[PDB]
Subunit: 380 residues, 4 copies
């Protein structure tokens, strides 16, 4: 039939894939090749990566997909394909770190100017648009406090003023949020997170209209970034995404239990999780997201030293900066990642001294809660 | 000891690699991971790719290496790290195709201007340099007639006028040519060709000073192209380069036999191969290159239709646009790759209607010569 | 801590694995090596496969694990380690096909005699035991009608008469059944099915006492079958088993829905599924198994030609002889696998002309039911 | 054409392989699958492993090939397919270690008796043959002193008395010796050594008549050992064997240089290498082998402690028990492998206290000789 007609779990398993016609092999073969041969002068890929691109296009409800070497390369291949010297971008402030350096330093050195705004306030996006604006760029939920962006409202604003909307959907995966259905033009992912889900692949994906994807492929990849994804990485990502539906269900079930535990804990001052009623944009989240996600941020009493003591006291949670793996991962941005940054700068970059970020995995939630309770008790 | 002190074949086998300290594993483990874990807050890669980078740095006699997703990404990560709007590049005209589009269209849209010159004439390079020139870019030997560029002379010119020299060494590999030893600042490769050699990896490498490579890594890769190489691709390239010395010796031994056969054939009007005395820059080749290479170009009598008939008549040689594999590969640019291009344009892009390009593999040269003789006889 | 102390889902994720001490890599590195190096004469693996063996030992609650090249090799390495000429085996009749040939022909040619019994009747096992009996061998649930064997009762019988009990736990996985906890001495799996779960690995595992596993390793593998598992296959199986808990939950949830649908369908004469109340050993199943499994057998009205027409009319279910993959798979033994076998022989081997076997995958059960309903309607 | 008609180097590159018809992929795809799908009931592998089997069959000049999980499994799958209780085997004494345990202990426990003889004396083979003898089994060259066996003469003897001849050709590879051309019936290899050559694959291969190979596959593998090779291991072996010709040429060129150096060294009492004129079977070697091999044994003055001191003093050669890798490997059996064995037993098992075994790699021979000279000087 047509894979676009089946239920979402069926699509997760089947879309973009079929038994090998030649051999009947059910698994997508790994076409680990660089060389393709022609039969004739007149009549003179990659099939593995093509399957991944088609599957993700189906899952995001877009026309076409393009796999890349990294999440970074998905974003830069996209924006460098769309923009040239003299052009302008309006970008959310609450965005991924390496994206910020690309937008803050790299783009301006190529004559491409960027205005950063608080995208939780759609009026700030509107006010920053210029005749030269080609692209509005947002991420949602956004780090570090998991604030949201109203995709449908921002898309309407962008389009009225003649710009494209590009959305980073990494945190959600297509299982939980579909920006193209809400009016975005282009979706990008780091598949490194939930789409692969197994913490063993660095890669990205771009999904959008065929017309744009062809330009991203034949100009962006070929003539600017060279950021192709290897066939083995595509095969692993295909393998990982088979369990996307059941993984996201369990991630989100576990995260909600852990978030409620943290909200009831007197040593925890704040808990940021879209699944909690006290989230500032809770109702927007319920319309825009099918599940509240696997990521939690929370603030422990006692600031910087309590945060340090807490992550040094966990025994099951692993200390790492990654997200979306099968293992529960924990990090303390003020002592770890943003440690060279001046306090007052971190402080309304949104990173308080006591802020902890947690990527909830597939372990028994009882074991994770026990580990957290033990570490919090010690840290305070 | 120090791997920088052993003979070149010993370095090919050993440089950048050692038994795994933890386990004693002799093969470099495949660190197929995205996530790395920290032991503490205070104390809070990729090891496979690191081994490849160190090996190639040793082989090129450079300080440091940086692996990339493709040969394209090696070149663009390099140039986009070095140049910003307002800067200038002097580039050889006789360069790889996708490189030309990057230099002709992409760079100028970022405000970076490029002048193309005939790099076989070092005076044209000098005459094109401007106060804004940051980089001189060359490839040697160069397609399609395997003309050469005098690296040492061009390096001297570039440096006197305050620019860096970047050399694409893909065609030669470090076994046959070492541009850094001749004064180049930066070497780039598509490892897709001879360094891997097995036609199953797309990838690139950049080699140069530690100071530059750190910028290419932490700014170029991280903040512009995102073009990282996957650990499995790095492991395969490490595996392939183990036989670099013995592969290049046989490629070049076979190519010289085939080139001499073609030079004696009355249906072949011209043969381009640096190992032949009639090559226009033969003596330069003997000083600059340790072996004349595995690539041959030649012109068959009868123009476009003879070229078409010839490649349609080979039965052992395979029709493909790739180079540097273990199989002998053949292509006819006028009918294949550059077929949409207007004849008169191709004609002193250097591509005549009868031009055939041959990548000589590891087969018995007698079998390749027999296949060629048969196909030439039919085609004419 | 000790991985033997956490909840089962936590064990699935973490047991046998830890961040690489040397590098911090979270994923288990792929030690694709044959050679291990020594530091000295005095002081003169595989680490990937070791992680898999330790994980499965923890999940089955056994002391030690041994990975093999195939499910077949797990069974034969076990039995050939335990038995020599003159010894005797009592085996269930309702067993996997290739196992039957090994037991029926191969063992007797080595002087090892085998008696086959109906293991659903523990008294038949007792009556077949001899002074020479070393091993009782069973599989449960058993094909093709998913009959059960009471592991605890059979273990007691075997042990009283001085024999070991070996159980094939492939159909269940350790998530759903733990034979060692019920008194079995040794468990074997084809990891090809649910433990890997992704239809891309052929492999086996043996779990039991350290004393036995050492003999299976240093004598069975090294000196009889040579059936080692490759490190890459072990790494893929480690990756697959990460989602074992969530996969089995969904397989079993989907299978129960599909089984109830089939039980209500007037064109379906019988449905065999341990989760249905009418299963002959339903209560035994509830004590012995935590979930009823992902495999269903059923008989369609109209015998051989209806069965043929049905499998030729499915459009989502895939025709294959495999089990335990993420895709729903279907087969018709009488027309497919056992087609060369005489009808009357198949008929109380348990294989009726109308019998269909179904491996339920991770698709939306509504889509699978719709596909089945369509195919059944056509077939009848 | 027919790959059986090209030169041996051409066969090494091309035999068993072709561009993928479906996609044009030049590299053999990795069919990492367990499941194969059928299109119909009526019409209801592995393609990667099949390519390897066909290539090695062509190279050994046999009809068919069968890949296995290990060299051990190649040997045991073969012999257990051929022999049953009551049968007899005549085997060389000078054979690989794990093979000896299989033949000495395992076979007799299955009622299969084995007589061990000195196969350098063909008359000992004849004298040991019995009416029950099914197989004569030899290895050549043989460890540890690299003695030879006259394959053609032994084949004639075996056949006159109605037995098959099985030859282990691991040490030589098909590039240097072709036992089937000399009258052997069956050839086995550990591909772990030279056929793969890169020290990262454990695997075996069996080559012989189609009639036998079908029995080894459908009975030996399926119903006795279960020792299949994984598709990824087959793909790596295919990749490794591409350079077999150029690797063996360099291994043997380097080994001859090193052997001549050792023969001239006054601290070295004996050197065992078929390429040296003083080898006891030198002329037989020249008829039977195209090159003298990459393996050298030699005795250092001063017995056990000198041998220990020597291997502890090398700085380039690596200490390991493996053979046939790209790195030079060294071992001292009396202190390392056979250390638990009583001296007088080792002593005319052929292992003297001063015996060193060397696997010569692809490094510059000057560097290896320098390392050896340094270590020998220290050790004495
Ligand atoms: C991690 C991340 C990226 C970058 O992904 P890589 O594959 O590591 O480059 C981009 N966007 C978001 C939202 C991320 O979390
Ligand atoms: C093929 C080639 C490249 C590009 O390599 P990819 O890995 O295919 O991007 C660059 N330079 C030269 C000289 C080449 O031949
Ligand atoms: C498939 C199967 C086996 C054999 O597994 P392989 O890995 O294919 O050898 C053994 N036992 C049972 C119960 C099976 O279903
Ligand atoms: C190493 C070796 C074997 C066994 O090979 P594995 O792949 O390690 O089982 C068999 N025969 C010979 C001659 C060997 O050297
Ligand atoms: Na699939
Ligand atoms: Na190595
Ligand atoms: Na892990
Ligand atoms: Na090939």
């Amino acid at each position: 039939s047509d894979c676009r007609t089946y239920g979402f779990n069926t699509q997760i398993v089947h879309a973009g894939q079929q038994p090998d016609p030649s051999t009947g092999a059910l698994s997508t073969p790994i076409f680990q090749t660089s060389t393709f041969v022609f039969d004739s002068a007149e009549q003179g890929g990659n099939p593995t990566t093509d399957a991944l691109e088609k599957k993700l296009a189906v899952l995001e409800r877009g026309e076409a997909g393009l796999a890349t070497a990294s999440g970074i390369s998905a974003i830069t291949t996209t924006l460098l394909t769309l923009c040239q010297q003299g052009d302008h971008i309006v970008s959310a402030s609450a965005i991924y770190g390496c994206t910020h350096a690309f937008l803050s330093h790299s783009m301006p050195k190529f004559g491409i100017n960027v205005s950063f705004v608080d995208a939780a306030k759609p009026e700030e996006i509107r006010a920053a648009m210029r005749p030269e604006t080609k692209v509005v760029y947002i991420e949602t939920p956004a780090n570090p406090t998991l604030s949201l962006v109203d995709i449908e409202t921002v898309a309407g604003i962008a389009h009225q003023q003649g710009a494209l909307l590009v959305v980073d959907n990494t945190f959600m995966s297509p299982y939980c949020q579909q920006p193209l259905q809400l009016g975005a033009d282009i979706v990008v992912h780091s598949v490194t997170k939930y789409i692969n889900g197994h913490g063993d692949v660095i890669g990205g994906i771009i999904v959008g209209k065929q017309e744009f994807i062809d330009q991203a492929r034949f100009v962006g990849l070929k003539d600017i970034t060279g950021g192709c994804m290897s066939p083995f990485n595509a095969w692993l990502t295909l393998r990982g995404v088979k369990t996307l539906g059941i993984r996201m269900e369990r991630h989100c079930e576990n995260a909600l239990k852990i978030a409620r535990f943290l909200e009831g804990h007197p040593s925890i001052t704040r808990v940021y999780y879209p699944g909690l009623s006290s989230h500032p944009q809770y109702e927007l989240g319920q319309r825009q997201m099918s599940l509240p996600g696997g990521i939690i941020s929370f603030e422990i009493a006692g600031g910087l030293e309590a945060g340090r003591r807490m992550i040094n006291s966990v025994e099951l949670c692993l200390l790492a900066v990654a997200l979306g793996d099968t293992e529960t991962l924990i990090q303390h941005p003020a002592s770890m990642t943003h440690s060279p940054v001046a306090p007052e700068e971190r402080l309304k970059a949104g990173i308080t001294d006591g802020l902890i970020r947690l990527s909830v995995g597939l372990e028994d939630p009882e074991d994770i809660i026990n580990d957290l309770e033990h570490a919090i008790r010690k840290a305070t």
